[PDB]
Amino acid sequence: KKAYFYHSSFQILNVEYTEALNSPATHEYRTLSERIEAMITDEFRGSSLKSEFIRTHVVKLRKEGTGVVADVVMKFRSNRKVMKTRIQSVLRRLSSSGNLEIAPSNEITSLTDQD
């Protein structure tokens, strides 16, 4: 078969960008990157792309505003447009606002289903 790479910039919800995030060598950077990679891996492992997904990795954490954005590369084995539409249906499971996002932790602020 053939290899395909996809990348996106995900808004990393509920995490303030701190200096430790400036360096890939820090505990903060590596643990957040590892959590994000585990989340993406788990989603594809539990999707229609389970046999095609190879692995993922955060290429870098960037600061946007005071929040964090993670540039992520995803590798698949298997048209790049076709693979893309399948991927989008999985990433949609990680989003709650329609944005390309990932929440290492979900904040609960009310007691009713706000959807």
CATH number for 31:
3.30.70.960
Residue 110 lies in a domain: no
Tell me, yes or no, whether 113 lies in a domain.
no
The resolution, in Å, is 1.9
Distance CA(36)–CA(39), nearest Å, equals: 5
Element (H, E) at 98: none
Domain residues for the domain of 2 are 1-105
Question: How many domains is the chain partitioned into structurally?
Answer: 1
In a domain, 33, yes or no: yes
The helix (run of H) or strand (run of E) holding residue 57 is strand 53-64
Indicate whether 26 belongs to any domain.
Answer: yes
112 in any annotated domain? no
How far is the CA of 65 from the CAs of 11, 18, 19, 94, 96, in angstroms? 11, 12, 14, 22, 20
Does 111 reside within a domain? Answer: no
Q: How many CA atoms lie within 13 A of 71 on its CB side?
A: 7
Phi, psi dihedral angles at 64 (to 5 degrees):
-130, 115
Cβ neighbours of 48 (radius 10 Å):
10
Separation in Å, CA 12 to CA 32, 51, 61, 62, 81: 10, 27, 9, 10, 26
Q: Identify the experimental approach.
A: X-ray
